[PDB]
Paper text:
To understand the molecular architecture and mechanism of DOCK−[name] GEFs, we have used cryo-electron microscopy to determine structures of [name]−[name] alone and as a ternary complex with nucleotide-free RAC1, and combined this with a crystal structure of ELMO2RBD in complex with [name]. The binary [name]−[name] complex adopts a closed, auto-inhibited conformation, whereas in the [name]−[name]−RAC1 ternary complex, [name]−[name] adopts an open, active conformation through a conformational change of the [name] subunit. Our study suggests a model for how upstream regulators control [name] activation through a conformational change of [name], thereby relieving autoinhibition.
To answer these questions, we determined a crystal structure of activated [name] complexed with the RBD domain of [name] (ELMO2RBD). The crystals diffracted to 2.4 Å resolution with a single molecule in the asymmetric unit. The [name] structure consists of six β-strands and six α-helices and is similar in structure to other RHO family small GTPases. ELMO2RBD demonstrates a classical ubiquitin-like fold consisting of four β-strands and two α-helices, but interacts with [name] at a non-canonical binding interface. In contrast, the interface between [name] and ELMO2RBD comprises both switch 1 and switch 2 regions of the GTPase. Major interactions include a hydrogen bond between [name] Lys9 and the main chain at [name] Phe37, as well as a salt bridge between Arg66 of [name] and Glu13 of the RBD. GDP-bound [name] does not interact with ELMO2RBD, while GTP analogue-bound [name] interacts with an affinity of 7.8 μM. A key [name] side chain at the binding interface is Arg66 in the switch 2 region, and ITC analysis revealed a [name] R66A mutant is unable to bind ELMO2RBD (right).
Author numbering:
A (entry chain B): 6 to 54, 59 to 81
B (entry chain A): 1 to 177
The structure:
Amino acid sequence: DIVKVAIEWPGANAQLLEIDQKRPLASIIKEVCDGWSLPNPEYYTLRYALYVTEQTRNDIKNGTILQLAVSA
Amino acid sequence: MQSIKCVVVGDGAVGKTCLLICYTTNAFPKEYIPTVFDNYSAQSAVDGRTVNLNLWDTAGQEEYDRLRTLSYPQTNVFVICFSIASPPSYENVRHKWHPEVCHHCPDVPILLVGTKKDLRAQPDTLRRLKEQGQAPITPQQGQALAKQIHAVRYLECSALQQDGVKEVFAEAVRAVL
Ligand SMILES: Nc1nc2c(ncn2[C@@H]2O[C@H](COP(=O)(O)OP(=O)(O)NP(=O)(O)O)[C@@H](O)[C@H]2O)c(=O)[nH]1
Ligand SMILES: [Mg+2]
């Protein structure tokens, strides 16, 4: 299963991605972080523009806009 | 060989997707499936030159309005569409679409496209629009809209009849080439 989303990062142009729901968020976040040349991806989390966790990952609907945010 | 980012926008159901499917495969899809966002890539030769035409399909439903605007940055040319059988989509161009595009991308050429040209003289379309006191959009009306928004060109086409779709994107690349 796949889901289309946009991920925003302040100052940069958003990335329009099709997320593979079989890949861990951690691999997706590392790829998304590379897209904006960001190290230390583990300290980032996707939240709605609420957090996207592995537990709720499948609640995401096509066309939803996510933010790449610095974790707590 | 240069690459051209071409973004197709317009009201929901005006035919932006069928437009891109016809140009890409000459098919015509069975049902209306709203677009979230989709990409097509094609090699096309215009005036003896070849370019990478990267076509970005866009959502016309208001639900995905802000999502649509995230695709805009660095667009080389916009194709703004309205249905010849939907005057409402005709009005939204000059009041909603042209303002929005100009704001996010000033000085980016705009090509104006009247889709579904085959419905201009169909009885069902004529009757329906007649009840509301309107008729299919006229070629003269399209030109007046193109002038008003400074479109580089005004074109009419029909994916269902495979009429003029090729020329639409040949002109998209020309506007920037
Ligand atoms: N008669 C006729 N119908 C057409 C033509 N092109 C598209 N349609 C119909 O118009 C309806 C909308 O088509 P579609 O390409 O999906 O429109 P869209 O602008 O991409 N919609 P969205 O903004 O939701 O993605 C569909 O039923 C399609 O069959 C055409 O040339 N002639
Ligand atoms: Mg569409």
